[PDB]
Structure formats: structure tokens, C-alpha cells
Amino acid sequence: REFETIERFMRKGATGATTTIYAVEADGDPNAGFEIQYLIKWKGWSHIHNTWETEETLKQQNVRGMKKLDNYKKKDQETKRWLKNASPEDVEYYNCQQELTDDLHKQYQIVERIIAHSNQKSAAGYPDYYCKWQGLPYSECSWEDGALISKKFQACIDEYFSRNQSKTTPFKDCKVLKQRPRFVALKKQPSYIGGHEGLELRDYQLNGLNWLAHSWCKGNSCILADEMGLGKTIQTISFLNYLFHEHQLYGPFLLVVPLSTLTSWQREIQTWASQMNAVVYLGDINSRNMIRTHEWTHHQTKRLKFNILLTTYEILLKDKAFLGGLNWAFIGVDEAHRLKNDDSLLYKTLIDFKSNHRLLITGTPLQNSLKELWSLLHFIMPEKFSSWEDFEEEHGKGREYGYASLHKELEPFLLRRVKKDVEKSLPAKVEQILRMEMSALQKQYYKWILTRNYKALSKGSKGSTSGFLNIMMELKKCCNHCYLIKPPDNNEFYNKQEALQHLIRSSGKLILLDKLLIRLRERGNRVLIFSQMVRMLDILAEYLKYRQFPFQRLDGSIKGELRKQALDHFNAEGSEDFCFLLSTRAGGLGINLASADTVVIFDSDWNPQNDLQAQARAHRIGQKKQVNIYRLVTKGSVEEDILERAKKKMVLDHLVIQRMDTT
Amino acid sequence: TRKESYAIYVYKVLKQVHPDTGISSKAMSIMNSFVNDVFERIAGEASRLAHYNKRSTITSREIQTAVRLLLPGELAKHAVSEGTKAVTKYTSA
Amino acid sequence: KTRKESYAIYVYKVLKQVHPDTGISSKAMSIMNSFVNDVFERIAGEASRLAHYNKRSTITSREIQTAVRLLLPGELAKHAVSEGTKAVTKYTSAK
Amino acid sequence: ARTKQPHRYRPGTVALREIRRYQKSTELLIRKLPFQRLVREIAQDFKTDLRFQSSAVMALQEASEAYLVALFEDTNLAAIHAKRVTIMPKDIQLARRIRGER
Amino acid sequence: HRYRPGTVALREIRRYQKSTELLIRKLPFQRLVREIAQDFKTDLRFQSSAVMALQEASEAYLVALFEDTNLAAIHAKRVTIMPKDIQLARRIRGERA
Amino acid sequence: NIQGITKPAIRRLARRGGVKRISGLIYEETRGVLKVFLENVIRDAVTYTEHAKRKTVTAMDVVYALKRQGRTLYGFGG
Amino acid sequence: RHRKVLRDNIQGITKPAIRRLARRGGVKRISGLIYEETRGVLKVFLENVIRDAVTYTEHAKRKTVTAMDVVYALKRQGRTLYGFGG
Amino acid sequence: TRSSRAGLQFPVGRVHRLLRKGNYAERVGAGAPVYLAAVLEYLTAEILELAGNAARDNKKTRIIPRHLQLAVRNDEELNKLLGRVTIAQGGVLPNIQSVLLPK
Amino acid sequence: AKTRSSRAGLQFPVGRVHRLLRKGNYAERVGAGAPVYLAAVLEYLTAEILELAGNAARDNKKTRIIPRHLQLAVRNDEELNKLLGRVTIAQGGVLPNIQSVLLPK
DNA sequence: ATTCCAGCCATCAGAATCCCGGTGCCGAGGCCGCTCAATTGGTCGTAGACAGCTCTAGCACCGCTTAAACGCACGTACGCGCTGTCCCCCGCGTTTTAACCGCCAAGGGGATTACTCCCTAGTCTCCAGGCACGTGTCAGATATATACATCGATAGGC
DNA sequence: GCCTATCGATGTATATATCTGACACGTGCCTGGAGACTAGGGAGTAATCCCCTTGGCGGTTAAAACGCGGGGGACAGCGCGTACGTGCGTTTAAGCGGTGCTAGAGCTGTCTACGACCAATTGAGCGGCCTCGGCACCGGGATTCTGATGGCTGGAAT
Ligand SMILES: Nc1ncnc2c1ncn2[C@@H]1O[C@H](COP(=O)(O)OP(=O)(O)O)[C@@H](O)[C@H]1O
Numbered sequence A: 001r002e003f004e005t006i007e008r009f010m011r012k013g014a015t016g017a018t019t020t021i022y023a024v025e026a027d028g029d030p031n032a033g034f035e036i037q038y039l040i041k042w043k044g045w046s047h048i049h050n051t052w053e054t055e056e057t058l059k060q061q062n063v064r065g066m067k068k069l070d071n072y073k074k075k076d077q078e079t080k081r082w083l084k085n086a087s088p089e090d091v092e093y094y095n096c097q098q099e100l101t102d103d104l105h106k107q108y109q110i111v112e113r114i115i116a117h118s119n120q121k122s123a124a125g126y127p128d129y130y131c132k133w134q135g136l137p138y139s140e141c142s143w144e145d146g147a148l149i150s151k152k153f154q155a156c157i158d159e160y161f162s163r164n165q166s167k168t169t170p171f172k173d174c175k176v177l178k179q180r181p182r183f184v185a186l187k188k189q190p191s192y193i194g195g196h197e198g199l200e201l202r203d204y205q206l207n208g209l210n211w212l213a214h215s216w217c218k219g220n221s222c223i224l225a226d227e228m229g230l231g232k233t234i235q236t237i238s239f240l241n242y243l244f245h246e247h248q249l250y251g252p253f254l255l256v257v258p259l260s261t262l263t264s265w266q267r268e269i270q271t272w273a274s275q276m277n278a279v280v281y282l283g284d285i286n287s288r289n290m291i292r293t294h295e296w297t298h299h300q301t302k303r304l305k306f307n308i309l310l311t312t313y314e315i316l317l318k319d320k321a322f323l324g325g326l327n328w329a330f331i332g333v334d335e336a337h338r339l340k341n342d343d344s345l346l347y348k349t350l351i352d353f354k355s356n357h358r359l360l361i362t363g364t365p366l367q368n369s370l371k372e373l374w375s376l377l378h379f380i381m382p383e384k385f386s387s388w389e390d391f392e393e394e395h396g397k398g399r400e401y402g403y404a405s406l407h408k409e410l411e412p413f414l415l416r417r418v419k420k421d422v423e424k425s426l427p428a429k430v431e432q433i434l435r436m437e438m439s440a441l442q443k444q445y446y447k448w449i450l451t452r453n454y455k456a457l458s459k460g461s462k463g464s465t466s467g468f469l470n471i472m473m474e475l476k477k478c479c480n481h482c483y484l485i486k487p488p489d490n491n492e493f494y495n496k497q498e499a500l501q502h503l504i505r506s507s508g509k510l511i512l513l514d515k516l517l518i519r520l521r522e523r524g525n526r527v528l529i530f531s532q533m534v535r536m537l538d539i540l541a542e543y544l545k546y547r548q549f550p551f552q553r554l555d556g557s558i559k560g561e562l563r564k565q566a567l568d569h570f571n572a573e574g575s576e577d578f579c580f581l582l583s584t585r586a587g588g589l590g591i592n593l594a595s596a597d598t599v600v601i602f603d604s605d606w607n608p609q610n611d612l613q614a615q616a617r618a619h620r621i622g623q624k625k626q627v628n629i630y631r632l633v634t635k636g637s638v639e640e641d642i643l644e645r646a647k648k649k650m651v652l653d654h655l656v657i658q659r660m661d662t663t
Numbered sequence B: 001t002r003k004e005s006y007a008i009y010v011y012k013v014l015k016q017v018h019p020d021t022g023i024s025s026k027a028m029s030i031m032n033s034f035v036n037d038v039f040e041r042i043a044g045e046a047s048r049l050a051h052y053n054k055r056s057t058i059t060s061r062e063i064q065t066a067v068r069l070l071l072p073g074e075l076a077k078h079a080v081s082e083g084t085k086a087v088t089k090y091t092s093a
Numbered sequence C: 001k002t003r004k005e006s007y008a009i010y011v012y013k014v015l016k017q018v019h020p021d022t023g024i025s026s027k028a029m030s031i032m033n034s035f036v037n038d039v040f041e042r043i044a045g046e047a048s049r050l051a052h053y054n055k056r057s058t059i060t061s062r063e064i065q066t067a068v069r070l071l072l073p074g075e076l077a078k079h080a081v082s083e084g085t086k087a088v089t090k091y092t093s094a095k
Numbered sequence D: 001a002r003t004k005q006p007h008r009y010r011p012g013t014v015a016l017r018e019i020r021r022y023q024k025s026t027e028l029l030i031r032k033l034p035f036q037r038l039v040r041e042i043a044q045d046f047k048t049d050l051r052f053q054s055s056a057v058m059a060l061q062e063a064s065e066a067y068l069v070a071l072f073e074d075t076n077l078a079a080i081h082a083k084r085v086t087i088m089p090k091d092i093q094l095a096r097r098i099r100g101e102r
Numbered sequence E: 001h002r003y004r005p006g007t008v009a010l011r012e013i014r015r016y017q018k019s020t021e022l023l024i025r026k027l028p029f030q031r032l033v034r035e036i037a038q039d040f041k042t043d044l045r046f047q048s049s050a051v052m053a054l055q056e057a058s059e060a061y062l063v064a065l066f067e068d069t070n071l072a073a074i075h076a077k078r079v080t081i082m083p084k085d086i087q088l089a090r091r092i093r094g095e096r097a
Numbered sequence F: 001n002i003q004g005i006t007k008p009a010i011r012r013l014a015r016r017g018g019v020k021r022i023s024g025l026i027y028e029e030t031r032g033v034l035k036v037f038l039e040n041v042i043r044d045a046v047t048y049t050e051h052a053k054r055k056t057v058t059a060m061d062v063v064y065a066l067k068r069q070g071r072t073l074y075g076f077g078g
Numbered sequence G: 001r002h003r004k005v006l007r008d009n010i011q012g013i014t015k016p017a018i019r020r021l022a023r024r025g026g027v028k029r030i031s032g033l034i035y036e037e038t039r040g041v042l043k044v045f046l047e048n049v050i051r052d053a054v055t056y057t058e059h060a061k062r063k064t065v066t067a068m069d070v071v072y073a074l075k076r077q078g079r080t081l082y083g084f085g086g
Numbered sequence H: 001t002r003s004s005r006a007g008l009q010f011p012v013g014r015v016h017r018l019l020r021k022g023n024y025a026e027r028v029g030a031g032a033p034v035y036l037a038a039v040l041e042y043l044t045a046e047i048l049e050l051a052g053n054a055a056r057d058n059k060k061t062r063i064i065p066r067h068l069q070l071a072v073r074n075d076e077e078l079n080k081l082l083g084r085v086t087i088a089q090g091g092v093l094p095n096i097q098s099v100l101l102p103k
Numbered sequence I: 001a002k003t004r005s006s007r008a009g010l011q012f013p014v015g016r017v018h019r020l021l022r023k024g025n026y027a028e029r030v031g032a033g034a035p036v037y038l039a040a041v042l043e044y045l046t047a048e049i050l051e052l053a054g055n056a057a058r059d060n061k062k063t064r065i066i067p068r069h070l071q072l073a074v075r076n077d078e079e080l081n082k083l084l085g086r087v088t089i090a091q092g093g094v095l096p097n098i099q100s101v102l103l104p105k
Numbered sequence J: 001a002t003t004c005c006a007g008c009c010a011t012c013a014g015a016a017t018c019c020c021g022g023t024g025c026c027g028a029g030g031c032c033g034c035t036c037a038a039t040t041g042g043t044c045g046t047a048g049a050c051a052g053c054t055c056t057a058g059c060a061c062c063g064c065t066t067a068a069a070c071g072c073a074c075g076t077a078c079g080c081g082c083t084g085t086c087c088c089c090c091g092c093g094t095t096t097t098a099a100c101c102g103c104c105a106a107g108g109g110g111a112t113t114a115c116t117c118c119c120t121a122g123t124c125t126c127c128a129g130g131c132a133c134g135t136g137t138c139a140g141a142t143a144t145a146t147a148c149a150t151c152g153a154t155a156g157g158c
Numbered sequence K: 001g002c003c004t005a006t007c008g009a010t011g012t013a014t015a016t017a018t019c020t021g022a023c024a025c026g027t028g029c030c031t032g033g034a035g036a037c038t039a040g041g042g043a044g045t046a047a048t049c050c051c052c053t054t055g056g057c058g059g060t061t062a063a064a065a066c067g068c069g070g071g072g073g074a075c076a077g078c079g080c081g082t083a084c085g086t087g088c089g090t091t092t093a094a095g096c097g098g099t100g101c102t103a104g105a106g107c108t109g110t111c112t113a114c115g116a117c118c119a120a121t122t123g124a125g126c127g128g129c130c131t132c133g134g135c136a137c138c139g140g141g142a143t144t145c146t147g148a149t150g151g152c153t154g155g156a157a158t
């Protein structure tokens, strides 16, 4: 059938080069007489050029980008008008915010690590050096004058050269992998640990290090489940350092640290284990390319230069290819309970990573089912636990002897030391549950939700009736605060002092919370608020801004770089921040705060282990004072219903766990 | 439980026309939907023909007329030829 | 001559109930009969397809209701549904 | 010693490239999640507390994209008819009216 | 006396839109229908109602096509219909695509 | 025979459509489109007639053919 | 700071999305008023389809809209879709 | 009889017979034909009322296809129901585009 | 053989078509030849579509028929385009076509 | 100081529907009788209505990356108004061809009816197409490669 | 105001080498299709007869058909100006991974109500007639455009 350009917008005479770090050292401030301007910022040049400049200097050089000044003018006018009307308390909050922000900005000027050096020996003795930025990703790396960097940052060039000349970097072939050496008992802390500062590991840490070493000599991987607050990471880095020195093993190591805890690990690997080079493999694609170019391979030998990496799960997943061939011996994982669901892509990714020793670090590995514990055990040695059905039949529930069998088999693979058995100095935790009655507005919204009479809630609100497809999550919102379901009408009250009263009376919980916070304020105790609803944090922040001192915040939207500063400011001695707003899943895990005496759980997670994790953020090694924990519960509401499940689960878990001790 | 479809028969047709070629699952679903649609269309036209002529039965002739009404030109002619051949071979048994 | 059924006697009663002093010619009547036939056929086809899709062997009143809602515009659909419900209620009353 | 002591395509070149690219690619163009949001919002007006199977939204998106593409083709023909190159709302209106959409 | 171009056109528009009679001569249409059918089967007979139905359908189709053509013409800011208008109308309708 | 559809007839049909001015080329196009429509309808009409084993094309055949083509006609039966 | 404002869901069919759909249709130049018109047309189409889909769902005593409901709704409008059932 | 019980002028028995001898479903419910008859009667009543109104507007007293066409095309809902339907002798709705009218 | 498709020499299921017609409420009776005829028609249409789909696939250097290939085959054939004129094939896209008036001379 | 086009109204011939009365057809709408199809009453057996139960799979977050959306700047291409020329159509008169109507005649095909017998639906027993589920591993998704057609658009040939 | 020529650089395309998930075959079993057999209604005829389609013909207007002039639209070429495209830096939110729950989508199974299929029987609706009014006709009636004479002046021009 071409001229420079402005980057951003932040006495008379002080301008130009003389104000730069080349001359301010010799002449300081050219004038400091009795108008005002803001810090220099140019597109294309490093921040280390900080100076004080005037409106005319840009014009004189004909810098392209003057038209950009209009937005800055808008900002200036808005700030001027807004600040005057701001209440004195809000003014204080804003001033503290500015004070912290300028310090954040300045921190960039401090160079952390020289990355590369140019063959052009300027002045025949000053090669150009590629300088890293403190608190900024590798994407911002720029070359700087060798002499200039030496004047203010001499030591860093010595660091980079010494590391470059070093030969401790790992090698592809190792005889240790073929046959493990004989175990040697560590009777006392080696002198090289802690450095000249003489830092001493606590005894239980030394015992755990001995246990981990013994397990390594047998070739068996292990799970470390030390009770939260005992410093698991210190023991991990101690094992790494032991592998370094007492075995001459400088093999690749890969610690998958969460994002919130990355900086803590980095600081501790710099203080401890200073003999090892660390690479924080975080940032955008370009920054990772920069690392993979400069800090990855020793081009003169094609050998690996790094010792310990610091990656997150989300980044490791998105670059799983590159590491797949560069097999690492010591693939460590922190906050390992993410591996409790073997189907999760992290499990399938890491299980294909050829590793010789994997150590999981999780405070509460027991979790809600034996399957999760089996999953972790499988991650230890896939050969010995390759079958689920066999394990299930071998450990049939109900019979009492099976639990003792479990506690026997776990002992060589899982190590855990309760606080009371290793450090009695720590004050005992105080747990109190404060019932509270729902407010009348809460009761009316609750009645409407239960009847699903959307007609009432819709009055003057954009809420969608289809958003009620999960009544549990809306009942929880109603219980917490009315504003979550129905945004408050800002036109009802123009005076803040009245809107604050309405906000307080709107939520029954706040009626107790404000009084509790004031009473703790009298004692001078700092308070940590953990909540699993991020909008709840917004509500609480708005409430705080009216009355109390500046507060730091930690939720998943806060970029990592700022979390370092927030944590340091709250922890730093002399801090005035009254309380810390921490989202549970983001900030409740791992971070070592140890600077507060109250931990208030606004809303309870479906999983009590997360709540226990949050409580332990304060109750850590650094606490010199007892911590009082208050769990908020709304009487006559589903929140108690959740707590009943929590009680059953907790009783069962405690009964099982207590069998581990020979009491 | 069991859902019945034309997957295997379309696959046989494919391995007759293009032995090497394969067929993705969504392509197979598309072909199944097309077969169902043409089936229902021809059946409906045949039913209308029967009701109009006050018949009570659908015969090969009704299907032939439905094909002539639905498919255009050469497609209809070839479909009619194939149907006549199939019926003849069936009777020849 | 064999018998050709039609709705003439019914359309005429409806006309004499909405407009007593009015009449209808032989072609307007044919148009009305065709319209009735077309609406019947489309509603019946909707009911049949609804039944087959839902794997059911009966054309219930509810099938006709959904068919009318699918086919007629909003206001016509609402009025037709109301009248059908009333008719069904009255029919079931004399049980 | 640093011490401190362009190309531009013309209007229409990229449009043709986009035309070719999106005629070649079959990938869905509207972002899935906002379309799901709009589908749910519209459905709310008919029956509250409705649930949607994941394939229902996909089918609706495919049908809507195909309908919009056909409408844009007709609109482009209408614009060319007026000896123009820009599609304007009256072009869509004419296309719909001819197609018979009220 | 002599009307300006356009007046009689609107007069005819009003005359024919108001009325209902068939516009095409019946006998030429009968001949066209018979000729078209001849290619399919010889000796065919047509009921008068069949021819009238075909005429009604054809007139309705042509009137609708002319309305669409008029809309297309106005789109180009013209007032006179020309073939490309019919072609555009058909293509948009899907008849010729 | 197609010429039997004369210029005045197409003129009148255009008038009913609201056309005020008609180009001289519209007539051939109208004749062609009419021929195509007639062919499409008549083929189905004959097909229906042939199935019935008849020789006279009835009005019902035309009605069925139009209903297939989406041109439902009321006035003769259905 | 954020003023708690939220954009309309209809505005979620962004200007680049209409631009891309136009590109697939062969459109070289797009007037700025097309976008609102396109949004309205899409809303009307979705309303027409979803009405029939919801009716079908209600008939089955179901509270979930299934792909077959959408297929049937589109088939009613003469817009048969393939690849999701039949 | 089965129509007086429903108060419908249309025939329920004929609708039942057509539903059964129509190849629509294996069996047909008792209530289906009454519903269908009521719907058809309502539609006919609406069309006839509009047609009679149109006839009054023309001073005639006998409905003819012109009247039905006018009624259908002047009602948006009825026009949408019968969009693809052409009525013999119905003519067209008087509609002259503005651009064609004189200044 | 014991299978009605072998007798007719078709691949499509003649008995399944007979079941569908018999259960679809299309008519009160179904002849023996109607299933065979309909099965043959369906088989021919499937073969016609698949030939073009495979040709399009081989043009793109592919080996599996995807919806794009089916759409290309359907839209590039005048007859199949009329039969499937109102059919939207998911994930099939559209035929490449740029109006002349848009490209420069 | 003076004035002719557009222009508000103008005012008066025609040229049109329309408005009206007559006249008078014929198709409505009413009545009659009688068929057959709808109604009443009965048994009868399965849809399907309801209940109880298992898990998909659908919803609601948080968290975090990172690509796409967004806002703004620049300039140039297209739109839309405008003017002017030309030809193409409209309107009208007069001639020519053919519809249209009425009465008539034929016989061909639709319609109908009696009678027959063959093919289909309904029931039963008995497997082997068919499908769910599992699985091993090539085709395609995906990195990194250069190779190849030009936004122009700049510089020199007239 | 033009031809060609190279890279302000740019984005497709056409090559590899992974690796990875979807897809092409295998295997158990249980439903559904296929061999038997039967009953009986519907389809298939051959007759008959009635209508209504086809074809003739003569007169008889209506329409179609040309032919001409001149008005006003079509359509081209020109000229502003603005809104659209392109491109960049910044932001937003989609997308995806992980964690919870549980509403509700499908199934099984029980047994009961309500349709199907009968039989008598009876009245609604059908075809067949029959006889006036609604609506054609068709005037001359009125009157409602409508285009060319018109009066004037403002405005730009004299
Ligand atoms: N060996 C040690 N000696 C003294 N203090 C220690 C030691 N190990 C840990 N710490 C304290 O623990 C804090 C770090 O907590 P860390 O154990 O890193 O948290 P994580 O639970 O994430 O491991 C530090 O502030 C430090 O003061």
C-alpha cells in the first residue's frame, strides 16, 4: 500500500589604599574626629580589602555600577524611618542582631587554609597563594599576595607547606588489610593524645577505646551506643588517632557527620587528632569540584592527600559515584539510626561501599522494632546477618530466654555504657509533665474541627478545606496555638501591648509557658525550647521579640554557615540570649550545647527516642549544674493519647534494656 | 487480583513485524488502550446497525460494515480483506 | 400499516399544560420527538457505561441520576435531578 | 605583583531554539506540584475532603498540557493569519470560538 | 436612487437571517447528490426526504463555516472574506489538519 | 453538476452567515467544501443502505451518517 | 521581613511554563496578556474535567479520584487519553 | 397505570420497554424508567415554554421549527445541550457584526 | 488445534473477543464469525501501528518502542491520524513543525 | 480681514418593509374503533447490600540542594497608525436559461406474511492459555568528550 | 548602501565508558475457554401487493446570467514608540529523601430484595377519517429608512 564593580552595600579623608591593610597598620585610622559611611565592598576583589569609604570615591574612579545605589538608598530610608518607630525592646533586638552580623561578616577575613601556590615567585621569594575563606565555601577561593598573607596569617602557609611536604598521606596498597596484627593492650593514655595541653580522656572513654581496638584486631566491625552526653565523637577520633600512630596506618577515613554537627566534629578533629588533615566536603557543585581538584589527589604521585572527610548524607548521596572506586577502610557513620530502614537510599549506597571497619554512632539504637536493630547489625557484618527470616525465628519474641540470648550476642558487637555506671558527677535528670487546659478559643476551634464545620474556620480566612485530610495533624496544631490554623487578623489591634495579650490568651500552653519562663528568668537559668513544628518556632519567636532578650534560632531553613555563629554565641561565656529555639529533627541531635538549665518540649514527637535525644543536648559532659526538663502536655486532648503510646513503648524498651545489666 | 489485557498478543505481533524490536511498558499500555478503544467503537457501531435493521445478532457482516464506516480508505479495505480471510480459514476447518 | 410509536400525544399534553391556547405543527412535533429520542439514547448510554465501568449488571435510578448530572448543564441538571427524585418518591409512595 | 599599593543573541534566535527543543522533548513542562495544588483547589469546589491517586494528577496534567499546546498552535495560526508574529489574547479567543468552546 | 455599496448587503443579511427557507435550488442539489452517490453504487434511488435532509445539513454546515470565515476576516481587520479565511476556519475546526 | 450551486446561492448562504462583502474566489472553495461534506455524508449513507440490502437511500440513512459525522439532524427521525 | 502573603494557586502555572507550552506549539513571540488568558482557559478545562471525574467517583461510593475517572471524564469530552488505562 | 402513580404525563412503561430492548444493561431497575421519564418531561416542558414565548413574540399561535430554534439558541444551557444539533427550518439567530455596520 | 485463534491463524484471542461481545451488552446474540473478524481487524491495526513505531525507533537508533515512537507513527500517517485524531498519547509530545513565516530567509 | 471642507441638522424624493384589511385553502386537532402492549399477579434465583477484614498507597510534615523563577536593565524589532494607489466587488439594468409547478403513467423495490431449519445460548466436564511473581542482565540513563553551525560583526573589497 | 570571514564565543550533535533499573523469559496454578449436546427462536427465504420514486411533458415566471461604472476596501510602503526578548545576579520553591499514620481502596462471604420470566386481561394509543380556523396569500394602505440636494459654523488656509 575594564572598570571595577560594586559587590554589595553594607573621619573625612580616610579612603583608598591608605585605609587598606597595607597601610592601616602603619597609620591606623587617618581621621577619627567628630559624616558616617559603611564598609567597602567591590565585585571581584576579596573582602580582606576592608576599609572605610565615602560616596565620592566610587564616582572619582568611574566605577561601573553607581546606578545600584538606588536600592541602598531605599534600604537606608526604610531603616531610618522604621527604627525610630520601633519600640525600645525591638530596637535593642535589632542592635544585637546588627552586632552579631558585623562579627559574622568580619570572620570571613580570617584565612583558614592555603589551597594552592603559583609557580611565579613574586619578589623571587613570595609565590602567590590560593587562600581559603573562613565560613565561606570553596567557591569564594581567590589568590592573594604571598607577603600580604604572611604578614597577618604567617602560620597558615607553614601549615600548607609542611602538609604538602609530609608523606603520611594514605596509599593504595596496604599489607594490614591482608592480615590483621596482634592485639596490644593499652594500659594508659598514650602521651601523644591531647598534645602539649595535656588533655586527658575520661576513664570510660579509655575503656571504650580499648574495646574498639580489640574489636578491630579481630576484624569485626561494631556499633557504639554510648548514652547521649558521654562524648561518642571523642572516642571515634581517638580510635582514628590510634590507627594513625600505634599502627602506622594512615588509610582513608570517611565520617558521614550530620549537617548540624559538622562544625563540632571539625573543631574536635582540629583540637584532637591534629596530626591528621581534614576536608569538609560540603558546599555547591563548584566548591566540591575545587576540593576534588586541589585537596583530593597528590599529583606528583597520584596518591590521596586527605585523611578524614566530613560529609553529610544529602551530599554523599548526590556524589555517590566518585567515592565508589576510592574504597575507604574506616567508613564511619554518625547519627546512624537513619540506617534503621534498609530500603532508605543511604543504606543501599553505603552497603555497596567497600569498607574494612564501619562504626555506627547512635544514642538509642533500640528503636521501635527488632528489624531496625537487625538492619544496623547487618550494616556491621552483612555476611553474619545476611538473612532476616533466620534471625526472626532465632529470636522469637515472648520467651524470656530469647532476650538474654540477644543480650549475649549483642555484647561483642554493640557497646553501651549508661551514665550512672560511668560518671556519677553528672546531675540526675529531672523530668516533669505539666498538664494544661485548652483555652476557650482552642476549645471552639477544636469543636469546629471535630465536627469538620469548615464554614466557621473559613470566615475571613484563606484556609483550604481540603487541608483537613489529616485531622490528627490539625488537632495537634489547634492544641499548640490557634494561629497555625487561622492566621490572626492584624487589624483587630494596632497597639502591640494588646496583641501580645491576645496572643498569650489565644494559646492555653503559653499561659503556663510565660509564667514558667519568667520564674526561670528570676533564677538566671537559660532555657531551650524544642518543637517539631517549624511554624511553632515562628510563633514563639514573634512572642519573644516583644518582651525578652535576643534569641537564637536553629531550624532546617537556617543555612549551615550561620548555625556555627548562633551556637558559639549562645555557648560563649557572657551570652545574654535568654533561650534557644531549636527544631527537633534539625537541632535536637548531636550538637553539644551544655550551656542551659531548662529544656522545654513544646510538642511531643511520635517517637519518644527523639525526645530523649533532645533532652540530652544539654545534659552532656560540660554541665556543671543540674538541668530541669519540662514536657508540655495539654490536658483533655489527643496529646495525652500520644503519650499513652509513648508510655507503653517506653515501658517495653526499658524492660528489654534493663536486662542488659546483671542487676 | 487478575487483570486481563492484550499484552502478550501485541508482543507476538511485534515479534512478527519487528523481531528485534522491544516495547516499553507505557507503550504497551498505550497499545492496550488503543485496542480497547477500537474494540468498543466497532462494537458500538455494530450494535447500532443491529438495532436499526431490527436484528438481534451481530454477524461478521455487521463488523465489516462498522469497519467500513470507521476506518478510512486503505485501512478499511485491508481490514476487510483480513477479516474475510480469517473467517474463510476458520470455516475451512 | 404497521405502527410507528411516537411521543406526539405526550409532547402535546405537556404543551397544553404549559400553554393551553397554543398548538404545534407537524414538523415541530417531529423535532421534539427527535430531541426526546436523542436525550433518551444519551442518558441510556451514560447509564450503561457507568454500570459497565463499576462492574454492575443493573441500570438503577442512581445511574440515571449520575448520567443526568454528567450530561446536562448545571441548572438543567439540578432541575432534572429534583424532578426525577420527586417522581421516584411518588412512585415508591404507592407501594 | 598585585598589591594595590559581549556576545548577545538577537531577538528570535533563542525562541527558535526553544521551539525545536520542546518539540523534540516529551517531558512534562508545567511543574508537577503547583499543578497538583491547583487540581486539588478546583476539586474542593465540588466535593470536600477528596483524595487523588497519584496517576490521576498525572493524567490531568498530560491532558491539560496537550490541550494548551493545541490551543497555542491554533493561536499561532490565527496570529500568522493577521500577518503578525506575536500571539495575543484575541487570537486565543478566535481559536476557541472556531473550535466551538463557550 | 443608487444605494452606496453595503446597504443592499445588509438588507439581504436581514432578509435571509430572519427567514428560514432553503437558499439553494432544489433540483441542482438533487443532481449533485445523485452524481456523488453514482461513484459508490449504480442504480441508487433517493427518497425525497433524504435529499431534503442532505440539503438542510449542507446549508447549516455552509452557514456555520461562513460565520467562522467572517470572524476570521475581521481578525485580519478586513471586511471581505477570501479563501485563506475558510482554510483557517477549517484547520482550527480540525476538518483539514 | 457542482456548478449548479451558483454564485447567487453562495451569496445568500454567506448573507445568512453575516457576510457583507464576498471575494470572487470564495465560490470555488465553497463548492469544493460542499462536495467534500456531501461525499463524507453520502458514503456512510450508502454503506448503511448496502447493509440493509436495499437500493433506495432513506432519510434515516442520512440521519445516521450525519450523527456519525457529528452533524445530528432533527426533523426526519432518529 | 515576610508579610505572610501567599500567591494564588492559579498563579502557580508560572510565566515560563506558559512560555514553554507556547514554544512546543511553535510560537515565536508572546504578548504579555496571554498568560492570564492561558490561566483562565486552563482553569475552565480543569473545572470541566474534574466535575465529571468527581461525579464518577461519587457514583462508585469512592472518596478517592482514580485515573480511570479522569480517563472517562476526558473521553466524555472527546479527549481520549492513552497510557493510564482503558 | 404506572405513570399516574408517578404524576408524569410521559410513559414509564414505554421507557422501561426501550431500556430493556435497548442493549443497555443486563437488567433494568424499577425506578430508572420513572427518573428518565421525569427528566424527559422536564426538558420538553422547558423547550415548549420557551417556544411558546417566542411564538407569542411573533404573534403566531402554532409552534414551528423557527420558534424552537430561537428558544434553543437564546438559552445558554439548551444551546450547550444541543450544540452539535441542527434543526430543520430553524434558520439562524439574527446577528450582524458591529464592524460591518456603518459609522 | 484446541484454540480458535489457531484455526483462523490469528494471534489475538478470538474467544476473549467473543466473551467481550457476549458480555458487553452490544446485542442479544453474537455470531461465530464476528469474533474472528474483529480479532483480525484488531491484529491488522496493531501490526500497522507497530511497523511504523519500530521504523521510527530504528530511526532514532533505539530498540524499544516508547510513546514518542507511537506518536510519531500515528501523526505521520494520514489514515491513522484520522482514526486517532482526538487521541492524546501520554508522553508522546508533538511532531516537529515550525511555520515558514517565523524562520528568516 | 475672508473663506471652503466636515459638520453638527437640514428637507425633500423615492424606495422599502410593514400594516392592514378580503379570500380561501388544508393541515391541524378532534372522534371512532380495535389491537397489542402494558398491567396485575406469582415463583423464582441470584445481584448486590452490608459487614469484617487486610494492607496498599495517600497525606502531612522537615530537611536540604540546586535548578528554575524572579526582578531589572537595555535596545531593537515588531505593532499599529497612516497615507495613497489601484482593482475588485457591488449595485443595477436587461436578456436568457432554467427551476418550478401541475397532471399523469409505470413498475420497481419496500413491505409484509407464512413457514422452515439452522445457529446460537445455556449447561456440563475438563484441562492448558494466561497471569502473577521472580529474576538475570542488556538498553538506556548518565558522565565526560570533542565536532560542528553561527547572534552576528568586525575589517576591506566598490 | 553592499559581499566574506572569525570568534566578542556558543549550542547543538555525535562519541565513548560506566551503571542501573526496567524488561525479556521461566515457572506454578487456577480461572476461563473449549469440546460436547440440546432446544428453539430468529433469520432466511419465496410470494404477494402496494407506494412512491422515476420519468414525461407544457407554461410560466423567477432566477441566473452577463455587462458597465465607480466607489471603497485591499494592500503595500513608511514611520514612530513601546513592549517584548535576552541576559544577568538573586532568590525562591520545586524536588526528592526520610519519618510518621491511617483513611480507605479492594475482597470475601452471607442472604435477602428485587428484577426476570411467565400467564390472563384489559385499556391506552394507534391508524383511519373528518371539518373547520391559522395562516397563507395580496393589496393598497400607512411610514421608515436613505442618500443627495441642502444651513450653517470651526478649523486651517488665503
Ligand atoms: N576526653 C575529654 N575530656 C574532657 N572533655 C571532653 C572529652 N571528650 C569530650 N569532652 C567534652 O564534650 C564536648 C563535646 O561533645 P561530643 O562528645 O563531641 O558530642 P557528641 O555526643 O556529638 O559526641 C566538649 O565540649 C568537651 O568539653
Ligand code: BEF
Pocket (backbone or CB within 6 Å): A227, A228, A229, A230, A232, A363, A589, A590, A591, A592, A616, A617
Ligand atoms: F549525644 Be551527642 F551530642 F550526639
